[PDB]
Design a protein around this ligand. Sequence first.
Ligand SMILES: C[C@@H]1O[C@@H](O)[C@H](O)[C@H](O)[C@H]1O
Ligand SMILES: C[C@@H]1O[C@@H](O)[C@H](O)[C@H](O)[C@H]1O
Ligand SMILES: C[C@@H]1O[C@@H](O)[C@H](O)[C@H](O)[C@H]1O
Ligand SMILES: C[C@@H]1O[C@@H](O)[C@H](O)[C@H](O)[C@H]1O
Ligand SMILES: [Ca+2]
Ligand SMILES: [Ca+2]
Ligand SMILES: [Ca+2]
Ligand SMILES: [Ca+2]
Ligand SMILES: [Ca+2]
Ligand SMILES: [Ca+2]
Ligand SMILES: [Ca+2]
Ligand SMILES: [Ca+2]
Ligand SMILES: [Ca+2]
Ligand SMILES: [Ca+2]
Length: 582
Amino acid sequence: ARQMEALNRGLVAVKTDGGIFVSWRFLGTENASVLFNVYRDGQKLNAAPVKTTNYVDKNGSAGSTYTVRAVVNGTEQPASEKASVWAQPYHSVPLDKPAGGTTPKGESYTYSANDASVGDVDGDGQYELILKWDPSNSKDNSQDGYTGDVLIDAYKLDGTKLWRINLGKNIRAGAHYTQFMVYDLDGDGKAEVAMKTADGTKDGTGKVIGNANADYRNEQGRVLSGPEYLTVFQGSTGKELVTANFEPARGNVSDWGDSYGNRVDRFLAGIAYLDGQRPSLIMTRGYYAKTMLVAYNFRDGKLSKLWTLDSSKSGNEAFAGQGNHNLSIADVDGDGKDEIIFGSMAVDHDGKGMYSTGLGHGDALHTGDLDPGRPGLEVFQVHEDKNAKYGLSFRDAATGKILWGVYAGKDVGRGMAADIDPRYPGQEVWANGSLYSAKGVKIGSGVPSSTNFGIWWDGDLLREQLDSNRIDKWDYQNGVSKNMLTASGAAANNGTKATPTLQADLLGDWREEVVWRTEDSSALRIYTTTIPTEHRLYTLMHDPVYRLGIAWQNIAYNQPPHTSFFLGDGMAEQPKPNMYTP
Ligand SMILES: C[C@@H]1O[C@@H](O)[C@H](O)[C@H](O)[C@H]1O
Ligand SMILES: C[C@@H]1O[C@@H](O)[C@H](O)[C@H](O)[C@H]1O
Ligand SMILES: C[C@@H]1O[C@@H](O)[C@H](O)[C@H](O)[C@H]1O
Ligand SMILES: C[C@@H]1O[C@@H](O)[C@H](O)[C@H](O)[C@H]1O
Ligand SMILES: [Ca+2]
Ligand SMILES: [Ca+2]
Ligand SMILES: [Ca+2]
Ligand SMILES: [Ca+2]
Ligand SMILES: [Ca+2]
Ligand SMILES: [Ca+2]
Ligand SMILES: [Ca+2]
Ligand SMILES: [Ca+2]
Ligand SMILES: [Ca+2]
Ligand SMILES: [Ca+2]
């Protein structure tokens, strides 16, 4: 059994024209025989216990409050936490927008709300939002220039700002720099926050790490010298718990494949259950050429290093040049322990390189049960090298064997995987203007109008699409996308990537919520679906691959999360998660 979060009922109630829509979690600790009673202000609404974890109360009002009681072995359990009614289709979390600044070159910049993650920092079973702020002069690794400070905040859903960490002048702003992990690493029931830090990083209590005044910014506005640190911060306070020297260490900038400072600063990170029971922290560096991955534990108040994979070591040459601007984490070989899907290569739970497809770097990656007729997980990936044998590859996750691929002869920058067509079993995949079945059979002539995120939003087991401030649904019979939601007043992030601040099943039933910032970053808006469903599934945060996907969603070029099992049309009934909570 794996350590997973002790979650509350996640009860939510939302005003609609047809009454109050109520939804809640089916928890990983609950059996299939569990049913529910719904109460409005202490009065039961349903004559018989309901199975599905959504309910429409036609008689409810904006002033109503709700509780749910589980019915276990014929006996009603204590009431859930109380839920009030959302007067809007989204819940707003007001933000403390940081003031703008000026760089040493006299350039002004302002802040916008950017990537988020979630963790329960106080252990009450409700997630907090951990938000990264982005200065308007943040930089790709290919670009020279100074950047504003990167700020990381924690908010409760009620709008309480718990803390701000300022990573300081020695941490450059941009997609590929700070990769922040939020997770209960030590198993006490409370999340911590881990990331790369430097001299001058200021914790949530205002304490500066290392050499407070050291300035290692070069004239390119890059930080290519000086110490580098790894810090675990307390989730509730942002206080520094432990700081160690960061590995993978920089060495020489040129070790990584250029001298101007691009390849050296290509970071990814993850949470992986390397021991099959408890989480470990993964920090990576490099992917275009030299590539390193290091694993750590944070347990019993100590940070410990577990292993290193270094492509520059004799025997590891095949593990250079393969990584994406993203990764996945999953138990692919069935031993209960997590492996790392690092673009075109994979790394075992003990840090040993498993395989490389040799197809090289790409920009999108999907690891899940894509072909439910083929035992094991599958990885769908796209490839940037115009001379790659395949521009899109669909492989056995464990062995790396290519099941099918298609030559593109060009950079294929986007690819998606989602069950959008029930006429073909399993998840469809699309890239480079074509849609395919899980078996590689081209379907029709179109593709969905986005190739970004997949989201479970409506009531059916097919997956919808998310891009920018929109949720769309694929009309598979007619081969066209149609809009389901346009979140007016909400904005996506990261320029052409057009990503939400976060997509995750963070409250209510199994459908995924979306967190988008407002245009002016004065608030985050959490949208939860009010489309009824006949289906009950365990909260996705209790799935061992989905939960890990939420932890890495922020990293570099944000990718959508996947479940460890096939969730889609014609799916088998999912088994209870094998888990315990702290
Ligand atoms: C942009 C940058 O922001 C902070 O790190 C400090 O105020 C520093 O002096 C300034 O140069
Ligand atoms: C306010 C504080 O001032 C100095 O100690 C450093 O510049 C540090 O990075 C900054 O956070
Ligand atoms: C400006 C922005 O920066 C990063 O998020 C990505 O490179 C994206 O494609 C670009 O549009
Ligand atoms: C939309 C906007 O685009 C780019 O300029 C930056 O990457 C920023 O972080 C993002 O939110
Ligand atoms: Ca909490
Ligand atoms: Ca903890
Ligand atoms: Ca495994
Ligand atoms: Ca293994
Ligand atoms: Ca790329
Ligand atoms: Ca499979
Ligand atoms: Ca399908
Ligand atoms: Ca659906
Ligand atoms: Ca939900
Ligand atoms: Ca990102």
